[PDB]
Amino acid sequence: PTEIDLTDPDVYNRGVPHEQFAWLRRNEPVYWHPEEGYWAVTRHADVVAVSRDPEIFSSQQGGTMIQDPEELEKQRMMMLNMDPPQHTRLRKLVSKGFTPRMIAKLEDKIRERAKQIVDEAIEKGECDFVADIAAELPLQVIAELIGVPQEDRQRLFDWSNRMIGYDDPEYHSSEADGEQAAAEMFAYAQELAAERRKNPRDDIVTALVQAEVDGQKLSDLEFNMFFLLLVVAGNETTRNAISHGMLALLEHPDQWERLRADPSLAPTAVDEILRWASPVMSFRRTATRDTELGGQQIKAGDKVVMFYASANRDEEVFDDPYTFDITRSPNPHLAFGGGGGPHYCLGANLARLEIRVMFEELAEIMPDIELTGPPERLRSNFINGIKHMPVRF
Ligand code: HEM
Numbered sequence: 112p113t114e115i116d117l118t119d120p121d122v123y124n125r126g127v128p129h130e131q132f133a134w135l136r137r138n139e140p141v142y143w144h145p146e147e148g149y150w151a152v153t154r155h156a157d158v159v160a161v162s163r164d165p166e167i168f169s170s171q172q173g174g175t176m177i178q179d180p181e182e183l184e185k186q187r188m189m190m191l192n193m194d195p196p197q198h199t200r201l202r203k204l205v206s207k208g209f210t211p212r213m214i215a216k217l218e219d220k221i222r223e224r225a226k227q228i229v230d231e232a233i234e235k236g237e238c239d240f241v242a243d244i245a246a247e248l249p250l251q252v253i254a255e256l257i258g259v260p261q262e263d264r265q266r267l268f269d270w271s272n273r274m275i276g277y278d279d280p281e282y283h284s285s286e287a288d289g290e291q292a293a294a295e296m297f298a299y300a301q302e303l304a305a306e307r308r309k310n311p312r313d314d315i316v317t318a319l320v321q322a323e324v325d326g327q328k329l330s331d332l333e334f335n336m337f338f339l340l341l342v343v344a345g346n347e348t349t350r351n352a353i354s355h356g357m358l359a360l361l362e363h364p365d366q367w368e369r370l371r372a373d374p375s376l377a378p379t380a381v382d383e384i385l386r387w388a389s390p391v392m393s394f395r396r397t398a399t400r401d402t403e404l405g406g407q408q409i410k411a412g413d414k415v416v417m418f419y420a421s422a423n424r425d426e427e428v429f430d431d432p433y434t435f436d437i438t439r440s441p442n443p444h445l446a447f448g449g450g451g452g453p454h455y456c457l458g459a460n461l462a463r464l465e466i467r468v469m470f471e472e473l474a475e476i477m478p479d480i481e482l483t484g485p486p487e488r489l490r491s492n493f494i495n496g497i498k499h500m501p502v503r504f
């Protein structure tokens with residue numbers, strides 16, 4: 112196969128290039144793509160090994176985005192781009208509201224919203240599965256969880272689209288759209304923080320302003336950058352799991368029948384949807400010193416790109432990896448990152464709950480859902496996203 116540039120958004124225009132990943136896994140699983148260049152890491156075990164060693168494979172040294180100085184400095188304030196010990200301290204501060212017990216307290220409220228969202232979509236008849244269902248549930252939930260009034264949730268969605276849509280013409284007008292979105296969101300976040308410091312509420316903003324670990328509290332910039340990451344993660348990952356999951360269910364109709372007949376299949380179905388969609392396709396690291404990975408010699412300063420979508424088709428880990436099987440078990444997919452990595456998704460419990468509740472509700476109402484046209488992909492080299500997906504109920 113020709114040596115495709117996996118950092119180029121256009122190579123994802125016709126979908127995830129799974130044949131390229133399949134050839135790499137079999138023939139060159141740790142592969143130097145020359146240009147500057149980068150190592151493509153495509154096997155599950157090697158993604159896990161890179162993930163769990165931040166001392167060698169740093170997130171701070173070159174950031175975590177896969178394309179090739181002001182950008183790095185303007186984003187080293189993101190928790191994603193920190194290494195221990197800096198990272199360890201920040202993650203201890205912001206994780207309090209995301210433990211499994213805290214998240215499980217939301218199921219009934221999340222189910223109440225999902226039932227109402229599905230009901231209104233069915234009443235409409237013909238709609239956009241993204242705007243009316245897949246994006247709307249995580250949007251309402253993250254607004255309520257953060258503490259943003261429901262009237263303001265559309266501001267959160269528009270900001271988030273501008274933050275990640277920097278390669279898609281529908282979501283960006285030029286290169287500074289995202290920076291301006293961030294400035295607006297920082298001002299909004301600071302207003303909310305000031306209010307909850309004075310008058311605490313049961314929301315994440317209050318949890319964050321009150322948090323204290325080892326004599327430390329969140330600084331202004333730390334708070335603002337974590338608010339930003341929560342809003343973008345809340346709005347640009349789960350909705351694409353739901354959209355690709357619905358598409359997979361319609362295109363593998365036997366699986367949809369099984370789920371409709373047996374709602375107890377939903378927890379395993381969530382993990383197969385996550386393995387299938389792999390909504391976050393890749394993240395980058397930088398080697399801090401000379402090292403060996405999979406018999407390949409990686410030099411200090413080298414860019415290393417972990418392809419979670421390829422890991423989630425690894426024939427050594429998953430039997431029949433190109434089959435969508437909602438009962439697949441076990442299912443050690445890497446959609447949330449390599450297990451053991453210090454940055455492993457902080458919201459994985461919330462994401463699983465949102466996806467589980469939504470598909471339970473779609474399956475129980477038993478509507479006949481059908482596509483009325485092709486879904487439109489987000490242009491991205493990072494997110495495996497669906498912008499629109501016309502359906503009829
Ligand atoms: C399908 C949904 C999601 C997927 C596939 C996903 C994926 C990921 C991945 C791959 C990482 C980096 C892991 C690593 O580098 O080792 C990550 C980190 C993170 N995610 Fe998730 N995510 C999802 C939903 C969410 C949600 C809903 C939230 C919050 C409401 C969230 C919050 C975060 C945060 C704060 C981090 C940074 C953690 C750190 O740097 O220590 N994510 N996510």
Ligand SMILES: C=C1CC[C@H](O)C/C1=C/C=C1\CCC[C@]2(C)[C@@H]([C@H](C)CCCC(C)C)CC[C@@H]12
Nearest residue numbers: 185186189274275289290293340343344348391
């Ligand atoms: C930070 C600021 C705010 C200050 C400056 O505007 C620079 C900047 C960029 C933010 C970006 C760049 C693109 C990718 C980022 C970092 C998004 C990130 C990849 C989201 C990941 C979501 C989830 C998978 C964890 C969130 C914010 C985005």
Ligand code: NA
Nearest residue numbers: 478479503504
């Ligand atoms: Na119908």
